[PDB]
Structure 1
Amino acid sequence: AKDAWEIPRESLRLEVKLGQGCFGEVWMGTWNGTTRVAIKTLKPGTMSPEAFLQEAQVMKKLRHEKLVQLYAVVSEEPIYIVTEYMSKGSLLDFLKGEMGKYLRLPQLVDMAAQIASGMAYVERMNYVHRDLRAANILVGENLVCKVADFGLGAKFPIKWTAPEAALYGRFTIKSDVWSFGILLTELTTKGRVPYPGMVNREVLDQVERGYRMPCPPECPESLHDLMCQCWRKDPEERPTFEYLQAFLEDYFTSTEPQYQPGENL
């Protein structure tokens, strides 16, 4: 009964409450009085410990510079899960906030490449995300982006979920690629909700019949084409994250070498 990830309760200090749920809370804090960190709590009773510590177990095996890193854990109720802190918050909040007005296509595509890199790691390790979207991406200094999962049948983010997954429960790394496509629209519209003006029911009927969001204003058609590849009716058709990462990293030389800054992108 000795785990290296275990830390003493006295070493943690919850300073600012960041959110709540029926299962627990999230806070910004300090570890060992030197490291700022994010802290997730388990509300006693609501959910079973082991069902909760499952996540921490997964995070113990995953390690990549573009994936939120598990720092420590307090495995005996009340349980605490500790990770690195990301100075700029969710990508979604960053995108629509004061910073959103200054971000241009070169920055937004670099952020996508990083997310793609994080997802390419998830892909190589054979895991599935199931809720990839801007609200689950964290932003740090110098625009570093990392994939996370705030755990935000039950609530279904239909607008971000591939049809085969939202209808028939088939969640795979390919349904995540579909989500990445949607994420690219959030990036190019500065965090706007996808399928504007459409409720879940119509989004389901529409995509079902082949509908796909059009090219966002000032967004090069070549990037919209990437989105469409991500939204291919057939999972296998969809590109891999390894492909997506390389395509985005090389984007301004191989695909859009004549790129010129506009008003918003």
Structure 2
Amino acid sequence: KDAWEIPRESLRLEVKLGQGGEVWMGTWNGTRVAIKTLEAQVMKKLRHEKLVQLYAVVSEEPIYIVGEYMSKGSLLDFLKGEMGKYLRLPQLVDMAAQIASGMAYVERMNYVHRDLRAANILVGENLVCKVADFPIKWTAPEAALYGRFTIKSDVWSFGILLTELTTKGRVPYPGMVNREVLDQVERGYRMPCPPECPESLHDLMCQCWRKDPEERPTFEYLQAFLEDYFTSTEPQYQPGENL
């Protein structure tokens, strides 16, 4: 036991959110939190404002891990919902930048987030997106074939995450099954520019999807590129029908 340990008595459950374990909403010290029932020692070293904050942990069966409650659930559910109809490119590039901001912290800390996708991004209020929950379509070849998981395989997945955003939560490589993707991507296939998406944003995706992992961008580059986007790259942006 360490200083992250708390009394299970100090937590009140209220609303169940999901299952799979089970995730609960509730109150701590009479503050609102989320409880994930039955580890995440990785969340102890990591403390960034675009990462879902770990609050506590009950270290005996049944295990309760307590973190900050993100009020809109996954980014995927948030895009497939009533909001994705209104979301345009500035709102999505904003979201992509917060995610890249979190993964650039991960990059500095020399960590790897093996499963990076919109199901694992959590949304709160005012388009706050945070990285959490530390997939052949989202996975880079070197990782899916030879196990070479690097921050550069996460750059690849982030580039796929950029397709999820620009498509309002569509599944990448549409119409293609897993083995069809593996064999296609190996042969050099990359997804084309999504509808109403600037080629400048798709050019960025194609950088994240380079053959050689070392020639891919950093999130430090990615988050800088995305924050400066509507000034340095597309200051000529007019809102289309969907983007």
Q: TM-score range by the shorter chain?
A: over 0.9
Checking the alignment, whether the CA contact within 8 Å between 1:74 and 1:81 is kept in structure 2 is yes
Residue-by-residue CA offset, 1:87-116 (whole Å, 9 max, x unaligned): 111000001100001100001001001000
Question: What is the TM-score normalised by the length of structure 1?
Answer: 0.89
Question: What is the TM-score normalised by the length of structure 2?
Answer: 0.97
Checking the alignment, whether the CA contact within 8 Å between 1:64 and 1:118 is kept in structure 2 is yes
Shift of 1:4: 2.6
- How far apart in 2 are the matches of 1:59 and 1:167? 27
Shift of 1:173: 0.3
Residue-by-residue CA offset, 1:60-104 (whole Å, 9 max, x unaligned): 111000001001111122211000001111000001100001100
Residue-by-residue CA offset, 1:204-224 (whole Å, 9 max, x unaligned): 110010000000000000000
**Matched position secondary structure for 2:126:** helix
**Matched position secondary structure for 1:87:** coil
Q: Which residue of 1 aligns with 2:165?
A: 187
- How far apart in 2 are the matches of 1:36 and 1:188? 32
Shift of 1:37: 1.2
- 2:132 aligned with 1:148: yes
Shift of 1:15: 1.7
Q: Give the paired residue count.
A: 242
Checking the alignment, whether the CA contact within 8 Å between 1:5 and 1:73 is kept in structure 2 is yes
- How far apart in 1 are the matches of 2:54 and 2:231? 36
**Matched position secondary structure for 1:253:** helix
Checking the alignment, whether the CA contact within 8 Å between 1:70 and 1:84 is kept in structure 2 is yes
Checking the alignment, whether the CA contact within 8 Å between 1:115 and 1:145 is kept in structure 2 is yes
Checking the alignment, whether the CA contact within 8 Å between 1:56 and 1:73 is kept in structure 2 is no
- How far apart in 2 are the matches of 1:240 and 1:91? 22
Checking the alignment, whether the CA contact within 8 Å between 1:65 and 1:118 is kept in structure 2 is yes
Shift of 1:25: 1.6
Gaps of 5+ in 2: none
Shift of 1:56: 3.0
Q: Percent identity among equivalent residues?
A: 100
Residue-by-residue CA offset, 1:185-237 (whole Å, 9 max, x unaligned): 00000000000000001001100100000000000000000000000011001
- How far apart in 2 are the matches of 1:3 and 1:148? 22
Checking the alignment, whether the CA contact within 8 Å between 1:174 and 1:238 is kept in structure 2 is yes
Quick check: 56-65 or 192-201, which moved more? Answer: 56-65
Shift of 1:14: 2.0
**Matched position secondary structure for 1:60:** helix
- How far apart in 1 are the matches of 2:41 and 2:100? 23
Matches within 5 A, 1:181-220: 181-220=159-198
- How far apart in 1 are the matches of 2:139 and 2:122? 20
- 2:35 aligned with 1:39: yes
Aligned Cα RMSD in Å? 1.3
Checking the alignment, whether the CA contact within 8 Å between 1:110 and 1:249 is kept in structure 2 is yes
Residue-by-residue CA offset, 1:32-71 (whole Å, 9 max, x unaligned): 22x2211111xxxxxxxxxxxxx33221111000001001
Q: Which residue of 1 aligns with 2:214?
A: 236
Shift of 1:10: 1.6
Shift of 1:165: 0.4
Residue-by-residue CA offset, 1:144-196 (whole Å, 9 max, x unaligned): 110001xxxxxx91000001100111100000000000000000000000000
Checking the alignment, whether the CA contact within 8 Å between 1:39 and 1:81 is kept in structure 2 is yes
- How far apart in 1 are the matches of 2:26 and 2:195? 40
- How far apart in 1 are the matches of 2:7 and 2:157? 38
- How far apart in 2 are the matches of 1:119 and 1:36? 26
- How far apart in 1 are the matches of 2:7 and 2:122? 27
- How far apart in 2 are the matches of 1:223 and 1:135? 21
